[PDB]
Amino acid sequence: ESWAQSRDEQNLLQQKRIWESPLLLAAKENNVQALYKLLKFEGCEVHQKGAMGETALHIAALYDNNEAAQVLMEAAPELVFEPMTSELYEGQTALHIAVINQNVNLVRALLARGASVSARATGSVFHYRPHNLIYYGEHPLSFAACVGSEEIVRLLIEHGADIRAQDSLGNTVLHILILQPNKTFACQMYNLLLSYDGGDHLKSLELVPNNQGLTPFKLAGVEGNIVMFQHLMQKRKHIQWTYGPLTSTLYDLTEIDSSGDDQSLLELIVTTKKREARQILDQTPVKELVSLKWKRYGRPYFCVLGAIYVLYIICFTMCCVYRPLKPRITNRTNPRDNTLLQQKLLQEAYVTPKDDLRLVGELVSIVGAVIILLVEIPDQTILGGPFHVIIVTYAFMVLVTMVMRLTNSDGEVVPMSFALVLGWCNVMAFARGFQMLGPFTIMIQKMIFGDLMRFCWLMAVVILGFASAFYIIFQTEDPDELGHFYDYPMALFSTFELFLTIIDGPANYDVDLPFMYSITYAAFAIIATLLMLNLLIAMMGDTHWRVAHERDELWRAQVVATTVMLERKLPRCLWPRSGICGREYGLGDRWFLRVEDRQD
Amino acid sequence: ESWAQSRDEQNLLQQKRIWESPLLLAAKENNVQALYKLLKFEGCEVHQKGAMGETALHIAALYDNNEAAQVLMEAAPELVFEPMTSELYEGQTALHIAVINQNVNLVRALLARGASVSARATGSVFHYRPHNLIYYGEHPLSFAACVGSEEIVRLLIEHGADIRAQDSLGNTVLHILILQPNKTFACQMYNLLLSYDGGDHLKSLELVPNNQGLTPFKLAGVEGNIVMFQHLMQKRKHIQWTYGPLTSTLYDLTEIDSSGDDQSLLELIVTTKKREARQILDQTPVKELVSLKWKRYGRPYFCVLGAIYVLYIICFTMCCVYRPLKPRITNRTNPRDNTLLQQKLLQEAYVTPKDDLRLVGELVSIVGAVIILLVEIPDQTILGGPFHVIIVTYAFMVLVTMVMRLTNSDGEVVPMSFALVLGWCNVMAFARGFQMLGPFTIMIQKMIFGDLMRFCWLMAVVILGFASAFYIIFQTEDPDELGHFYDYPMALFSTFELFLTIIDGPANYDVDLPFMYSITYAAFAIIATLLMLNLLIAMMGDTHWRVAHERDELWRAQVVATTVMLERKLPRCLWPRSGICGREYGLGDRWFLRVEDRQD
Ligand SMILES: NCCOB(c1ccccc1)c1ccc(Br)cc1
Ligand SMILES: NCCOB(c1ccccc1)c1ccc(Br)cc1
Ligand SMILES: CC1NC(=O)NC1CCCCCC(=O)O
Ligand SMILES: CC1NC(=O)NC1CCCCCC(=O)O
C-alpha cells in the first residue's frame, strides 16, 4: 500500500541523494568543473551509490550529460560495467539509459570502453505490466529497436549483439516490436533486424517461438497488430500470375490454419479477450479462409445441429405437456382454501396404452442430456458462446427431473419446468449466424449479461420502497376486494408487475381506497415511466454508426468462433481441410488457398 | 424602469450636447480650424462639461482625434487631469479612453503632459456586471492589459504604474486577465506583467489574493479558464527526469489540495455552478489527484456507507412490515360501507414475545435519523448531490412517525409510509459512482428536477379537461357497474391512470355506455399517445454525441464532488493526504504527487 507510492517515494528519495551527494549532484547538472574538483583533488567516493543503487555515471546518463559522463569514465573506467542494484532497476547499466535517450555519440563512445551488449534489465519497472507505461524488454538491443533509433540498432550488432537472445518472457527482439504503439515505423525496424539472421531456411528468428508458444507472426494476430500482420504476410504468400487487373495470389496457410493443435492462429483469435484481434479475421488471407469455411461445411452442419436440437427439445416438451396423472387425490384442498393444486405423482407407472411413447420420449430426452454432458465436460467465462452455458445446465435439470422422478416429490414441477425455458431459449443461439437475426441475438447477449445486472440493481430499488408502502397501505385494508398486497411477498410481486404496467393497477370503485394509496400510486407511476424512458434513452448511445458495425463485427466474429469450434470437434471423414496441398505439385509441402482479386 | 433605457437615453442625451455645444461638436469631428476659432478669439468655455460630465478632451479621445486633442491640451493643459463626473463614468479620465483605443501616439503624448497612472474608473458602466459587455477593471494599467496592447502596458509602467494595485473588487491586473475572452493572447500578456514584480520569493503578485480570497492561479480554476490554468501550472511543477519517451513530472499540489479550509481548488470546483470549471478536474495535474482519490479510500468508504445505508433501511422496513396490531376493533365499518380499514393502533405495547426485536429495531431506526440530522445541520440548492436532500427529510419523517407514535393517530400510516420510499430511492444515489449506472442516475437527476416539472404542467392540463368531462359523462350513469368517475377526486385519479394506459379503460358490454363516453374517450386516447410520443421525441436532442459525454462528465464530476466531501468529513486516522511531503528530502515543504507520462 502501495506499489505506485513506493516508486513515487523512491523517485523523490533518489533526488534526495542527488541533492545530498555532491558527486551525484554535479553529475546531474553536468558540472565538469565540479567533478574534477571532487575526483582528482581530493579523491572522494567515486563509486558512490545513490538511493536507487545508481552510480554517478547512471545519473550522468539519465540527463544527456556527455561531458559529465566522459569525466566519470576517464577518471574511473570501471563504472561502465556497474549495473543498478535497486530492485526497481535490477540489471540496468549505463548503456541502457544512453540507448533509450538515443545518445549516439555516447553509445558509440560506450562501446569503445567495452560495454556489455547482453546485460538483462530484470528490474521490476522493466517488466511487462500495465503499471509500466512501456515495455522495451531486457536486452539493450531490444531497447534500441523500440526507440526506433536505427543508428543504434546496427551499432549494437557491430559489437556482438545477439538477435536470438530472449528475455524472461521468452520474447525475441521481434516479439517485442509487435507490442509497440508506432506500428508503421516498427515495420522498417522489423526488417532491419531480420537482415542479421543466419540466412538459412532452418532455425530462423521469425520461427523462434515465444515462451508461451507463439511465433512473431502468430503473436501479431493475437495482439491485433494489423500493420505487422499484413507485413509478416509478405514473407508467406506467392503471386501466381498477373492478368491485367486480376492477380491470383497463393497464401501460405501454414500457421494460419489448424492443426495445431492450439498452435493455430484462428483458434487464438476466437478465444482471446482482445477487442483488437477481432479485426484480424477481416484480413485478405484470412477473410477468404473463414468465408469458405462457412458457406460450405460450416453453415449446413450448424443448421443440422439446430435442426437436431429443435427436434430434440420439441420431444422433451412432448413429455412435459403429457406429464403423468393424477389429481390431488388428497383432502389437502381443505387446509388453506387458496390451494388449487391437483398434484400429479407416480407411480402409477407404467402399464402403457399410449404411455409407452412417453417412456421412449423420456429415454430420448435423458440420453441427449448425458451426450451434451459428455461433450461439454472440458478439462469457461468467454464471449463466443454465452448461450451454451445454459445447455449444460439444461442437461443438469433433466437429470434432476430424473432424480425428481423415481422419488415422486411434490416439487416435481419446479425442475421439470426449468428445463422448458432453458432448452428453447437456447435455440435462438442458432439464430447466431443464420441471417440478420444473428446480430440481434448479439444485442440480447450484450444486454442480458451487462446492462441488465447493473440496471436491475437500480430497478431493484424503488420497487421495494413502494412495495413496502403499498403493503402498509393495504395491510389495513381488507384483501378480499382488491388485495394486490395481502402479504409481503406478493406485495413485492404485485408492485413489480405494476412497474411494467401489466396489471390494471388496484382499481376498485365499489369500495373506497385509503387516502394514502391514491397519493402513493400516482408518484410510483410517474417515476416508473421516467425510470423506464431513461432506460430506453440509455439504449441510444449504443446505436451510433459504429455500434451497428461493432455488433455486426461481433456477429461474424462469433460465427467464425462457431466455425472453428465445429471443425475441432467433428471428425475428419467430413469437412476437408480448406485449401489445396502441395505434394506433386511439390510446391509445399503445406496447404494453400488460391485467391484472386481485382485492383480498380 | 429601466437601467438600460437610462444609458440608452444618456448616450442620446450626450450626442445632443455634442451637437448643441459647438466646442464638443468640433472636438468630435476633429475640426482643428474650428477649435482655434473658439478658444483663442474669442475665448469661450474651454472647460465645457457635456451631458456625461465629459470635457472636450474626453470627446476628442472617444473618436481617435489626436489633432483635435493636441489643440485642447496646448490651449488648456488642465483638461488632462479632469475626470468624467457623471455616475455612468465616475472616475474615467482622457487616458483611459486613449488606452482603450490603443492610441499609442496619444498615450505617449498624454504621459508627457503628466497624466495619472492610478486613476480609478468607478463608474457604473465599468463594474463587473452581466449588462456590461466587458470588464477591464478600474486602473488604466488593467485597461492596457485587457486590450492586448503590449506597447501601452510597458509604457504605463514606465511612468510609475503599480501592478500591485487592486480595484473595488480586490482584483489585481492578473485577476482581470483571467476573466477575458482572448485566452491564448492573455498568456503572453500575463507574462509581460509578471516581469515587473519585486522578484523576491515572498510578497509576489501571483500570491496577492482576491478580496474574495482567491489567488490568480485559484481564480483560473473556478472560472474554468483552461488555457490560463495550464499556463499557471508551469510555475509550479518540477520535472524529475526524462527517460526517452517517459517523463516523470512532480506537481506542486499546494493550492490544489485541501486544506484549506475552503481555500482549496478542488472544493471550489465541486461547489460552483460554472459549467466550464467542470473541465478543470480533467487536467493532468488534477485528474491524477482525484483518480487516485477514488480508486483507494474513496470508492470503498462510499460503498461502506452504502452497505451501512442498505442495512439501515432494510431494518427500518422490517419494523414497518411488522407494524403493530390490531384490527379495526370498532363498528366504524358500518358507516360508509366502502371502508375496509382495519386500523392498527397502540398500545397494546409492549409485553414482548418476539416484539422486543421490533423495539430495538425502532431504536436503531431513530438513532440513525438524528445521526443523519446531526451531520446534516450545516450552518443548499446545489447539483453535486440532489438525492440527499431526501435523506434529511427521511429523518424528518422518522421523527414524525415517532411523534405519530406515542399519540396513536388514525393517520399513523401516512408518515410511516413516506419514509419507505424516500429511504430506498435514496440508495440509488449510491449508484452514482459504482459503475455505469452512475450516469444513468444522472439522467434521472436531470429529468426529475427539470424536464418533469415543466412537462407536468403540460400534462397537468388535458387530464382535468377530460377528467371533468368523464365526471359529467358518468355523473349521470350509475357508478355501481363501471364507475371509474363516481366522485370528482377519483374522476381525476382514474383519468390520470388512463393517461398512462394502466387501467383497461371503462369497458362494460352488459350495459350501454352513454353516447358521449364512446366519443370523448376516443379523442383522449389519440391525444394521450401523441402527447406521449412527443415526450419521447423530446428526450432525443439530449442524446446527441455530446450529451453522452456531458452526463459522463457530470457523472465523474459528482463522483469527484462526493470524493472531496467525504475527505472533509471523515477523520484523519484514515484517508492519508494524497501525495508525498517534502521534509528531508527537503524539497518542499509541501505535498507532491509524482506522475509519469509517455509522449507518443
Ligand atoms: N457448447 C459450448 C459453447 O457453445 B458453442 C457452440 C459450439 C458448436 C455449435 C454451436 C455452438 C461455442 C460458442 C463459441 C465458442 Br468460441 C465455442 C463454442
Ligand atoms: N448529504 C448531503 C448531500 O449528500 B452528498 C453525499 C455525501 C457523502 C456521501 C454520499 C453523498 C453530497 C453530494 C454532493 C456534494 Br458537492 C456534497 C455532498
Ligand atoms: C531511478 C532512475 N535513475 C535513472 O537514471 N533512471 C531511473 C528510472 C527511469 C524510469 C524508468 C521507468 C519505466 O520504464 O517504467
Ligand atoms: C459617454 C461616453 N463618452 C465617451 O468618450 N465614452 C463614453 C461611454 C463609452 C462606453 C463604455 C461602456 C462600457 O464599457 O460598458
From Swiss-Prot, chains A, B:
Glycosylated. Phosphorylation at Tyr-135 and Tyr-136 by SRC leads to an increased calcium influx through the channel. Probably dephosphorylated at these sites by PTPN1. Residues 560-564 are annotated as: Interaction with S100A10. The modification Phosphotyrosine is found at residues 135-136. It is a multi-pass membrane protein. GO terms for molecular function: calcium channel activity; calcium-activated cation channel activity; calmodulin binding; identical protein binding; metal ion binding. The keyword Phosphoprotein applies. Expressed in duodenum, proximal jejunum, cecum, and colon. One of its GO terms (biological process) is calcium ion transmembrane transport. A motif (Selectivity filter) lies at residues 503-507. Residues 488-507 dip into the membrane without crossing it. One of its GO terms (cellular component) is apical plasma membrane. Ca(2+) binds at residue 504. Signal peptide: none annotated. ANK repeats lie at residues 18-48, 52-81, 90-119, 136-165, 169-210, 212-241. Keywords: ANK repeat, Calcium, Calcium channel, Calcium transport, Calmodulin-binding, Cell membrane, Glycoprotein, Ion channel, Ion transport, Membrane, Metal-binding, Phosphoprotein, Repeat, Transmembrane, Transmembrane helix, Transport. The chain crosses the membrane at residues 301-321, 359-379, 386-405, 412-431, 452-474, 519-539. Residues 67-77 are annotated as: Interaction with calmodulin. Glycans are attached at residue 331. It catalyses: Ca(2+)(in) = Ca(2+)(out). It is found in: Cell membrane. Residues 1-300, 432-451 are cytoplasmic. Calcium selective cation channel that mediates Ca(2+) uptake in various tissues, including the intestine. Important for normal Ca(2+) ion homeostasis in the body, including bone and skin. The channel is activated by low internal calcium level, probably including intracellular calcium store depletion, and the current exhibits an inward rectification. Inactivation includes both a rapid Ca(2+)-dependent and a slower Ca(2+)-calmodulin-dependent mechanism; the latter may be regulated by phosphorylation. In vitro, is slowly inhibited by Mg(2+) in a voltage-independent manner. Belongs to the transient receptor (TC 1.A.4) family. TrpV subfamily. TRPV6 sub-subfamily. Homotetramer. Probably also forms heterotetramers with TRPV5. Interacts with TRPV5. Interacts with S100A10 and probably with the ANAX2-S100A10 heterotetramer. The interaction with S100A10 is required for the trafficking to the plasma membrane. Interacts with calmodulin. Interacts with BSPRY. Interacts with TCAF1 and TCAF2. This is Transient receptor potential cation channel subfamily V member 6. The gene is Trpv6. The chain holds residues 67 to 677 of 767 of the full protein.
